[PDB]
Amino acid sequence: PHERVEQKVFLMSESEKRKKLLAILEQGFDPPIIIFVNQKKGCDVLAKSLEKMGYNACTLREFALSNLKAGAKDILVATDVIDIQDVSMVVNYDMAKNIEDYIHRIGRTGRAGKSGVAITFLTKEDSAVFYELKQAILESPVSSPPELANHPDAQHKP
């Protein structure tokens, strides 16, 4: 998936994540989309805030995917934990703790067809995946990131 899914990253501090997400969402999207977080409490609280901002958000059984599929809900919030349609956009609100989980996430834009986009928020707490993340993107002809590629923590295997 990394070779064939368009990937974009933003380096930030943790406190900046919510406002960057909102700015992204405000640009508009093609529902449904998926936002991944690392812990299930995150899942629930992020989801609340979005419903506060007037967004239709599901948390994460079959019931959730039907609505998304139907157009009812537009945003699925979820942790690394089934079967779901191809999405236009995956946002890694929290970066995965290993590159295999990251690969599986962005793979949700679909096996083929529209490349889709995976947007990842990177903080200093994610330094141990920088090198592999850098490789994932440098091996992606459908992707353009000097901020990561040149970063001091992306230079050697963890």
3-state secondary structure 71-135: CCCCEEEECCCCCCCCCCEEEECCCCCCHHHHHHHHHHHCCCCCCCEEEEEECHHHHHHHHHHHH
Helix %, strand %, coil % of the chain (to 5):
45, 15, 40
Q: What is the DSSP letter of 156?
A: S
Classify 44 as helix, strand or coil: helix
Would you state the structure tokens that stand for residue 60, as one six-digit string? 């994460």
- Residue 40: enclosing H or E segment and its boundaries? helix 40-52
Would you state the structure tokens that stand for residue 96, as one six-digit string? 């995965």
Resolution (A): 4.6
Classify 26 as helix, strand or coil: helix
CA distance 119 to 21: 10
CA quadruple 10, 27, 58, 42: dihedral sign: positive
Q: What is the DSSP letter of 153?
A: G
**Cβ pair 87, 79 in contact under 8 A:** no
**Cβ pair 4, 115 in contact under 8 A:** yes
Experimental method: cryo-EM
- Residue 20: enclosing H or E segment and its boundaries? helix 17-26
Q: Phi and psi (nearest 5°) for 77?
A: -100, 140
CA distance 145 to 9: 7
Closest CA to 110 of 25, 29, 33: 33
Measured distance between the N- and C-terminal CA atoms of the chain, rounded to whole angstroms: 22
Give Cβ neighbours of residue 135 (< 8 Å, ≥ 6 apart): 99
Residue 141 carries which side chain, given as an amino acid letter? P
